[PDB]
Structure prediction request, 252 residues.
Amino acid sequence: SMQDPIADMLTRIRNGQAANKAAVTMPSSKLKVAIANVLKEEGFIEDFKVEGDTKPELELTLKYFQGKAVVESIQRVSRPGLRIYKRKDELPKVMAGLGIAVVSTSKGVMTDRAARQAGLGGEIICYVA
Amino acid sequence: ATVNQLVRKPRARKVAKSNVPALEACPQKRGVCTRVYTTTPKKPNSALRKVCRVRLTNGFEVTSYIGGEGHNLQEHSVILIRGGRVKDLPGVRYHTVRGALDCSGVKDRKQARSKYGVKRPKA
RNA sequence: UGAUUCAUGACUGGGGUGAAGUCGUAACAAGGUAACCGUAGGGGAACCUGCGGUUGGAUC
RNA sequence: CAGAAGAAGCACCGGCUAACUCCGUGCCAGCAGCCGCGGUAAUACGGAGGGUGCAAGCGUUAAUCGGAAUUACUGGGCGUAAAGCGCACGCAGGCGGUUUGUUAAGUCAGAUGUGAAAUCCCCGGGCUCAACCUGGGAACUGCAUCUGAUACUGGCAAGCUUGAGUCUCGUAGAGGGGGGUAGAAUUCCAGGUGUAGCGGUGAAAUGCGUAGAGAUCUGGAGGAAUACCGGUGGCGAAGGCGGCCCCCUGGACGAAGACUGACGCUCAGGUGCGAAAGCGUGGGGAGCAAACAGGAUUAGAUACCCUGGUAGUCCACGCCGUAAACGAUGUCGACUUGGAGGUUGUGCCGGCGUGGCUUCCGGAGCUAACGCGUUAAGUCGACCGCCUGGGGAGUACGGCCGCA
RNA sequence: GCUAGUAGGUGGGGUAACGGCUCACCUAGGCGACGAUCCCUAGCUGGUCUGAGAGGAUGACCAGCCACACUGGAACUGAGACACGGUCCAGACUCCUACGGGAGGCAGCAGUGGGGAAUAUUGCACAAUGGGCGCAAGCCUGAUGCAGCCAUGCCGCGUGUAU
Ligand SMILES: [K+]
Ligand SMILES: [K+]
Ligand SMILES: [K+]
Ligand SMILES: [K+]
Ligand SMILES: [K+]
Ligand SMILES: [K+]
Ligand SMILES: [K+]
Ligand SMILES: [K+]
Ligand SMILES: [K+]
Ligand SMILES: [K+]
Ligand SMILES: [K+]
Ligand SMILES: [K+]
Ligand SMILES: [K+]
Ligand SMILES: [K+]
Ligand SMILES: [K+]
Ligand SMILES: [K+]
Ligand SMILES: [K+]
Ligand SMILES: [K+]
Ligand SMILES: [K+]
Ligand SMILES: [K+]
Ligand SMILES: [K+]
Ligand SMILES: [K+]
Ligand SMILES: [K+]
Ligand SMILES: [K+]
Ligand SMILES: [K+]
Ligand SMILES: [Mg+2]
Ligand SMILES: [Mg+2]
Ligand SMILES: [Mg+2]
Ligand SMILES: [Mg+2]
Ligand SMILES: [Mg+2]
Ligand SMILES: [Mg+2]
Ligand SMILES: [Mg+2]
Ligand SMILES: [Mg+2]
Ligand SMILES: [Mg+2]
Ligand SMILES: [Mg+2]
Ligand SMILES: [Mg+2]
Ligand SMILES: [Mg+2]
Ligand SMILES: [Mg+2]
Ligand SMILES: [Mg+2]
Ligand SMILES: [Mg+2]
Ligand SMILES: [Mg+2]
Ligand SMILES: [Mg+2]
Ligand SMILES: [Mg+2]
Ligand SMILES: [Mg+2]
Ligand SMILES: [Mg+2]
Ligand SMILES: [Mg+2]
Ligand SMILES: [Mg+2]
Ligand SMILES: [Mg+2]
Ligand SMILES: [Mg+2]
Ligand SMILES: [Mg+2]
Ligand SMILES: [Mg+2]
Ligand SMILES: [Mg+2]
Ligand SMILES: [Mg+2]
Ligand SMILES: [Mg+2]
Ligand SMILES: [Mg+2]
Ligand SMILES: [Mg+2]
Ligand SMILES: [Mg+2]
Ligand SMILES: [Mg+2]
Ligand SMILES: [Mg+2]
Ligand SMILES: [Mg+2]
Ligand SMILES: [Mg+2]
Ligand SMILES: [Mg+2]
Ligand SMILES: [Mg+2]
Ligand SMILES: [Mg+2]
Ligand SMILES: [Mg+2]
Ligand SMILES: [Mg+2]
Ligand SMILES: [Mg+2]
Ligand SMILES: [Mg+2]
Ligand SMILES: [Mg+2]
Prediction:
């Protein structure tokens, strides 16, 4: 059965980029929206919108640069079978700082750079490169 | 293997056995020769290789190679053996130390003398 | 009076290695009866035969 | 003060591996960590000259980690290389769709206490230098307590309907269990006609036949299996299931709605099902046929071929629990270009859609390759099973199970 | 699968002190697949070796903790011991004896024999640091400070320089 909606979100992005899809659609959730926000502010996706009331639907507009997917790699880190939490001094660096790690801190979901500036650790959701 | 499976049954290291068990982790061992003789090697080699059966101070009874050209060993000789298999000899896992105890050095040896118990010539 | 462990024992079971003597030729080609699996019976030996199964069978 | 005066060895030189020639030897003597070297032109054995590496040491042996991602947490595998339990159900366990509130256990931040000194590390100091000694820091990645944070995970409360399930109507089906029946054929028995062969093989012989066979006709008995339909067709968890009829009964699918409200997924141990052969008791026995007998073939022929033929194959009940039980591919869920078919629903106007199951090809991607390719061996998540060189060996011993 | 002082309770006793620590009585519990019980091996740590790290291996010297003192058992004295150079009993060994009976314990330092591939001198001094006793002077101190032996390791230097 479905047991990790976040990994399903990342996979839909990974598979949609490989299929040269202009957009991917998926059932929504506040955590998925919080992750979509970070992906947009970092310029990895183009836009997102939530549509619907009783069964919300999240749609992510993917971007391509020179005919290549912008998301070169996207990978789940913390997962239901094995949670990963890091302290502020041990937050990971993705691609020597060229990528991002999406971290869930007590001040919300943000990148690893933002969590370092706020002096917070948290749960490492995924790497994006 | 999933981490759940490793929590129950962790990874297991393979214990390795020594190729020289009669030494019992000692660098050498002293023994008494019970038989000195020759033997022929495995294919594809041919020779009359000099070996000896030697009862060690710990009770083990093993076969040891006598390297070098010519030796002075006979039954009841007291020798010192060290590790070292002889590839083409079936089940010979030890070498005799030339120049220790009753084993004499090799005569007229000029190169690699320390490996055959030969003192420096006075030239 | 038990348990366990080590040593040892006429004789006996199979195993490994070496060496190649004797007996055949089971497998590899359709290997000259396609091979193999489980099971059962038989036979100096490799094996053979029955029953079901597989293709990891050549030809067509 | 005196005078170079007292002070250099060990291993190696075919490749890995820095360093090559001659002579001796001739599968001998010998070397060897491995690959291997030695058979009369040996850079591999032994001496020599030359060289290389270390140097008051140099080699050898033992032992640990490394290289070994070769137990893989970091950081591996399981179609064919070793590896998916034969198939399920399911307790413990692991995991858990979506919204709000609350809690603050996990998690995060800060503080305090502690984490002996030495050691390691950093900046220094002192022995002529260095080793060594030493000042000060850092570190001791931990534990406890306190105070905060609340995104995520957990707890508690309340929901929601998209996962899962219930109801209604219908559809296809060798799904299962029980009973009945039909026609074809084989064998046997009886009788009629009829007469010298039949049967078998590569060729034969054994065998059957003038005591009348074989052939042909009529009647009867009995057991087992269901031609055609029949299909890379269907059903079933797998094993498997095939004439027709009745009775009892399981699952799947579709169309419209209604209902419950996460009730879910996976599963060590456990339990159930599980081809054929085999075992026990009682029946049955046509055909077939291990064993066995005879005839052939052959050097032999404990076979292949022929003539016979008993267990068994069949039924009832119980046991056994294994198969190349195979897609050599665990279960569940999501996502990702296409083409041609089969089968079974259903909507609409043969035409256009939309579901379920299924066969072949092939794209990206993956793969050691072969190949797989929306029914993945692609891209991911949850849980389980399993592998760790070949042989010894799925064997021995012990346990459990079994009548064996 | 294990356990009958076994698990808990009450009361008495006991200890410097809580306690099945012990006893009487009552209850029938307690431990265990988060591995009890049984079997094999083992002193633990700070650290040490290796490794890029994670790990793996290891626990000599130095420092902290524990245990032991010929073997088995026991208490006495004392602030503290169930006591290495104290006591008692038993045992195995060695020794003395007038045969009745007695003596001893290097796993302190040095040393001997033995085992082993293998590991040192029966040294000097309390001058320093520290410990016991003493008002102190001081006495004692194989702790310690030093010396001897061994290339065992690490580090430095020489074995000539120029021509
Ligand atoms: K040879
Ligand atoms: K015995
Ligand atoms: K065969
Ligand atoms: K074959
Ligand atoms: K068979
Ligand atoms: K025979
Ligand atoms: K010559
Ligand atoms: K792994
Ligand atoms: K039915
Ligand atoms: K099971
Ligand atoms: K027959
Ligand atoms: K023949
Ligand atoms: K029969
Ligand atoms: K069976
Ligand atoms: K198959
Ligand atoms: K269809
Ligand atoms: K249709
Ligand atoms: K499983
Ligand atoms: K039986
Ligand atoms: K007690
Ligand atoms: K009490
Ligand atoms: K350690
Ligand atoms: K004792
Ligand atoms: K003491
Ligand atoms: K003193
Ligand atoms: Mg053959
Ligand atoms: Mg054959
Ligand atoms: Mg078997
Ligand atoms: Mg036979
Ligand atoms: Mg046959
Ligand atoms: Mg070279
Ligand atoms: Mg030559
Ligand atoms: Mg040479
Ligand atoms: Mg490793
Ligand atoms: Mg591998
Ligand atoms: Mg194979
Ligand atoms: Mg295999
Ligand atoms: Mg399977
Ligand atoms: Mg299940
Ligand atoms: Mg959740
Ligand atoms: Mg908390
Ligand atoms: Mg410290
Ligand atoms: Mg200085
Ligand atoms: Mg310091
Ligand atoms: Mg919460
Ligand atoms: Mg919550
Ligand atoms: Mg059967
Ligand atoms: Mg039988
Ligand atoms: Mg039967
Ligand atoms: Mg019967
Ligand atoms: Mg036959
Ligand atoms: Mg099997
Ligand atoms: Mg099958
Ligand atoms: Mg099949
Ligand atoms: Mg299998
Ligand atoms: Mg294909
Ligand atoms: Mg593969
Ligand atoms: Mg067996
Ligand atoms: Mg059984
Ligand atoms: Mg207590
Ligand atoms: Mg009491
Ligand atoms: Mg011990
Ligand atoms: Mg490593
Ligand atoms: Mg007292
Ligand atoms: Mg004392
Ligand atoms: Mg003493
Ligand atoms: Mg001593
Ligand atoms: Mg000795
Ligand atoms: Mg004195």
